[PDB]
Ligand binder design. Structure first.
Ligand code: NAI
Ligand code: FMN
Ligand code: SF4
Ligand code: SF4
Ligand code: SF4
Ligand code: FES
Ligand code: FES
Ligand code: K
Lengths: 44, 213, 430, 263
């Protein structure tokens, strides 16, 4: 039903100190390979 | 807060520090986020992860990051000293931060800071003797319509009063965690006298789309 | 049209701005998001840029640069280097909280805008830079990006269009100077937040030396709605060269501080009296209003009555729209202490690269502390005006102008108050 | 060819594409004041001394970095250019210590010379000056960081020519300090050139300290015999007594550097 009172952003009360990095680690298996500049480092 | 380091017995290059294997996996994901040839672009998140593991940055996480990412350690020192979110000194468990910019100073954040100071028995930049709190003064934190406000670790406590924030500190001293949000009748950012706008339901998909799309 | 204000709820782009509805993908698709995105990505980058140009959208970061031309600067064949969109969500300017609400409650609008903007200039990926202190907002954005990835809306074969586009989220480490575009580009690359010089523009050399476009969250999150509803619909609001709607953050000495979407040319008095509930103590108690956050000069009560809230109506009133953040100070405000606090804030958040800001912002901080205490003679008011003129226009980035402008506004509109405070201290001390 | 025509004070000169305003003014015979620009280090543009007013443009550009294009008129001695130079030098001398009589750079200081030539004549500063803690980088270079103006020639020389990567800028705002952040000795074979390229007396020569003054040393051009490179040098003496050895400009051997054994 149409609700205009209850706050629906209640997921962020259960965020630990590793949530962002674990989410990034989960996303790291969905992404395309990165382009390469032809050297491993700028000083190589 | 000095920008030069002296080798104390508690902070020396021989201080033991290393990443846990799951943190190594997160570090390798962070490195894989960036293009090849620019592995130095991951200095910020790996250093932040090292801080979240250790609680503070000695001079053993910086050289470990420099060895892992193959960069000169001077660049890691520059990055650590430039940014204010990197703790080069061991802070307490709860890092209280009170924002005293003009949009918060107009709504009397000084009363909140004074109440915290005379509750914990310390001053700005000082830690409790049992290493549980650390009170510093920061700039604007992006919640100016929720002024006054403080930030404790990753939690934003907004629309505070001296009695309410004294109760919040009491809750933290008992080991409990409070709810990171505004403490008045408002929920996130709406006016306290009800919704002036967006009282209509959203129209849903397919509304007002132009012809030919 | 000549009368502006009172935007209807059907015309507001940011539904669920207050967080009262579901912010996840089910809540996003029940409101209009991710609709006909395959057709948008298939109609062409030139078509998307033309729809943006016809809308008359200007940059909501604070510069007011026309977003159509700025996004059309990247429409060039690639020389082998990749091309990047970078969405900036640093939001370190005082008085501004709109982008935090956009990240927290509407992440799907942001990532749909990221996909559309990436198609508009042939970008390879998106690097959303978010503030270090916005941990829960960045986590919500990552959750929404994972939800979009798992449904195939972005990633490989994005929305069944054959376009390749990734979205990445990076986090800052507490530096306001990183909000600048070139400073953000340097901060992404693993360096300090020291801004580069122009030329080279980011369209030629940006992040990792690649072509890059830096765009605000508010100028990205409206692009799908512009491309769906139509450019002329977006250009039907506001005056000429001020087309569209805007998020306004009213804070300070007001009855109800709030973030509200509104038409562009709404009067400031109408905005305060309709959405903020009025000035604390009534409209007669008003002393000063900062129109666009701490970078823009203030205006007093007499000017503030009949000024529209757009770019031209404030430029002609020797101020700027900025981040459209209205800070209200009533008559109980020590305005000199507030401006001295602003100069102290600009003193702390300066990268120190180029010497006029690095020395003179501390100089104005010292003389403003002395002005607040009243320990001065009236000649250093004009000396401070000369110093602020010496900084404005001789720096690498625009933080020097953003620190010089409030001093000039305070001098110009409130020199008698400075003079009487200083002469009162001189009488009481000697 | 690809020569483009630019105007310096109304005088037309030909320049290659990509040439900065500073190099064009040097081609016509004008020397733009500069602090952070060196012809062999990378372009930094963080001292704002080289600001010059291109006509029909209401914003001064940095001559050390901005390239010229066709039809640009460069007003090198206009009113707003001089005002910009005076303001930049006022900001530079706001926090400088009154250490000229105790300085080894006195009489050969770049800052003193272009303050006499392009700066103003008196001070409006009235507050307390800053103070920077002095660092130790070795028994070759004497370091007094209260006099450093953060020109970042240290970092560029150690990162591009010496190739050591041991100098950096730690801090933010007015409290930014050029240093090594730890007790580390900058020991390379080219560690006197940072003394050479420091525009102020922050990095001076430790063996030369408090011995002579530049206006009295007789300069005699000679050849280094320490190595087989054949570096051209200047021996500066004082009353029949060798005081110090400086490099000579010679683009074919030792462009403006020498090894510290020679020095
Ligand atoms: N939103 C915020 O949090 C803050 C906003 N501001 C506002 O930001 C503004 C200053 O920012 P800037 O980025 O310096 O503004 P503006 O000088 O740069 O230009 C805005 C954008 O247009 C591009 N651009 C401009 N001319 C161009 C050209 N000829 N060719 C190619 N690209 C071109 C720039 O690269 C930039 O991305 C002020 O209005 C200030 O009030 C200031 C501080 C904080
Ligand atoms: C010191 C400084 C801080 C800035 N911070 C922000 C910011 O936090 N968010 C923002 O959108 N623009 C900020 N800007 C403005 C940007 O330089 C740039 O105008 C903006 O990121 C993109 O503008 P656009 O809306 O046309 O895309 C800042 C500028 C300066 C000089
Ligand atoms: S004006 Fe200040 S913040 Fe901007 S580049 Fe110069 S020193 Fe840095
Ligand atoms: S470096 Fe130059 S200006 Fe500074 S004290 Fe020495 S001689 Fe004087
Ligand atoms: S010590 Fe000298 S050369 Fe080094 S950064 Fe400072 S002024 Fe420049
Ligand atoms: S001024 Fe305090 S949160 Fe912005
Ligand atoms: S010489 Fe150009 S800014 Fe320093
Ligand atoms: K020197």
């Amino acid at each position: 039903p149409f609700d205009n009172t209850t706050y629906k952003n209640l997921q962020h009360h259960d965020y630990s100190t590793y949530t962002f990095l674990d989410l990034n680690l989960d996303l790291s298996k969905f992404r395309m390979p990165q382009p390469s500049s032809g050297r491993e480092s700028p000083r190589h | 807060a000095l920008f030069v380091h002296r080798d104390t017995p508690k902070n020396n290059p021989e201080t033991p520090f290393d990443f846990t294997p799951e943190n190594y996996k997160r570090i390798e994901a962070i490195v894989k986020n960036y293009p090849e040839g620019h592995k130095a672009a991951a200095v910020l998140p790996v250093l932040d992860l090292a801080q979240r593991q250790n609680g503070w940055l000695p001079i053993s996480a910086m050289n470990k990051v420099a060895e892992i990412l193959q960069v000169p350690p001077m660049r890691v020192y520059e990055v650590a000293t430039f940014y204010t979110m990197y703790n080069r000194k061991p802070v307490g468990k709860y890092h209280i931060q009170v924002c005293t910019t003009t949009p918060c100073m107009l709504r009397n954040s000084d009363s909140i800071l004074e109440a915290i100071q005379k509750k914990l028995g310390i001053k700005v930049g000082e830690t409790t003797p049992d290493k549980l709190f650390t009170l510093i003064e920061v700039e604007c934190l992006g919640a100016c319509v929720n002024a006054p406000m403080v930030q404790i670790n990753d939690n934003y406590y907004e629309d505070l009063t001296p009695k309410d924030i004294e109760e919040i500190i009491d809750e933290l001293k008992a080991g409990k965690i409070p709810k990171p949000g505004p403490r008045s009748g408002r929920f996130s950012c709406e006016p306290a006298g009800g919704l002036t706008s967006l009282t209509e339901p959203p129209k849903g998909p397919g509304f007002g789309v132009q012809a030919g799309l | 049209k000549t009368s502006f204000g009172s935007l209807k709820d059907e015309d507001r782009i940011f539904t669920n701005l207050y967080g009262r509805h579901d912010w996840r993908l089910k809540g996003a698709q029940s409101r209009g998001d991710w609709y006909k995105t395959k057709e948008i990505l298939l109609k062409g980058p030139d078509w998307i840029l033309g729809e943006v140009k016809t809308s008359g959208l200007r940059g909501r970061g604070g510069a007011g640069f026309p977003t159509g031309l700025k996004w059309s600067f990247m429409n060039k064949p690639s020389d082998g280097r990749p091309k990047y969109l970078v969405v900036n969500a640093d939001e370190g300017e005082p008085g501004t909280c709109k982008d935090r609400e956009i990240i927290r409650h509407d992440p799907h609008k942001l990532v749909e805008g990221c996909l559309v903007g990436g198609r508009a200039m042939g970008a390879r990926a998106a690097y959303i830079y978010i503030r270090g202190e916005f941990y829960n907002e960045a986590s919500n954005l990552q959750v929404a990006i994972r939800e979009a990835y798992e449904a195939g809306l972005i990633g490989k074969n994005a929305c069944g269009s054959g376009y390749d586009f990734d979205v990445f989220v990076v986090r800052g480490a507490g530096a306001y100077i990183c909000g600048e575009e070139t400073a953000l580009i340097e901060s992404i690359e693993g360096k300090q937040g020291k801004p580069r010089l122009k030329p080279p523009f980011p369209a030629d050399v940006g992040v990792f030396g690649c072509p890059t476009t830096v765009a605000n969250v508010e100028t990205v999150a409206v692009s799908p709605t512009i491309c769906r509803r139509g450019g002329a619909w977006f250009a039907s609001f506001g005056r000429e060269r001020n087309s569209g709607t805007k998020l306004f953050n009213i804070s300070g000495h007001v009855n109800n501080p709030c973030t509200v979407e509104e038409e562009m040319s709404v009067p400031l008095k109408e905005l305060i009296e309709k959405h903020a509930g009025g000035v604390t103590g009534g409209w007669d108690n008003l002393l000063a209003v900062i129109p666009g956050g701490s970078s823009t000069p203030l205006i007093p009560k007499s000017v503030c009555e009949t000024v529209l809230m757009d770019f031209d109506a404030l430029i002609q009133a020797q101020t700027g729209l900025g981040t459209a953040a209205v800070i209200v100070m009533d008559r109980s405000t020590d305005i000199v202490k507030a401006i001295a606090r602003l100069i102290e804030f600009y003193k702390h958040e300066s990268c120190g690269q180029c010497t006029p800001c690095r020395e003179g912002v501390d100089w104005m901080n010292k003389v403003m502390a002395r002005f607040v205490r009243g320990d001065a003679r009236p000649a250093e008011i004009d000396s401070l005006w000369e110093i602020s003129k010496q900084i404005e226009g001789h720096t690498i980035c625009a933080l020097g102008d953003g620190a010089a402008w409030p001093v000039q506004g305070l001098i110009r509109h409130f020199r008698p108050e400075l003079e009487e405070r200083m002469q009162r201290f001189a009488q009481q001390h000697q | 060819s690809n020569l483009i025509e630019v105007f310096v004070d109304g005088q037309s000169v030909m320049v290659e594409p990509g040439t900065t305003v500073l190099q064009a003014c040097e081609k016509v015979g004008m020397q733009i004041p500069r602090f952070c620009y060196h012809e062999r280090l990378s372009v930094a543009g963080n001292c704002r001394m080289c600001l010059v007013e291109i006509e029909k443009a209401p914003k001064v550009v940095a001559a050390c970095a901005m390239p010229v294009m066709k039809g640009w008129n460069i007003l090198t001695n206009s009113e707003k250019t001089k005002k910009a130079r005076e303001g930049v030098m006022e900001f530079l001398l706001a926090n400088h210590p009154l250490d000229c009589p105790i300085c080894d750079q006195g009489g050969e200081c770049d800052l003193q010379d272009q303050s006499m030539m392009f700066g103003s004549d008196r001070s409006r500063f009235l507050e307390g000056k800053r103070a920077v803690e002095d660092k130790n980088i070795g028994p070759l270079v004497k370091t007094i960081m209260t006099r450093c103006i953060q020109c970042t020639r240290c970092i560029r020389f150690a990162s591009e020519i010496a190739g050591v990567d041991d100098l950096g800028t730690t801090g933010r705002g007015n409290d930014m300090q050029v240093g090594t952040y730890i007790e580390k000795m900058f020991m390379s074979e080219l560690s006197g050139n940072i003394i050479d390229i420091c525009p102020v007396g922050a990095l001076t020569s430790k063996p030369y300290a408090f011995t002579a003054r530049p206006w009295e040393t007789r300069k005699t051009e000679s050849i280094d015999v320490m190595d087989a490179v054949g570096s051209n040098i200047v021996v500066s003496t004082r009353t029949g007594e060798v005081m110090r050895i400086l490099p000579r400009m010679h683009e074919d051997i030792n462009e403006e550097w020498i090894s510290d054994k020679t020095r």
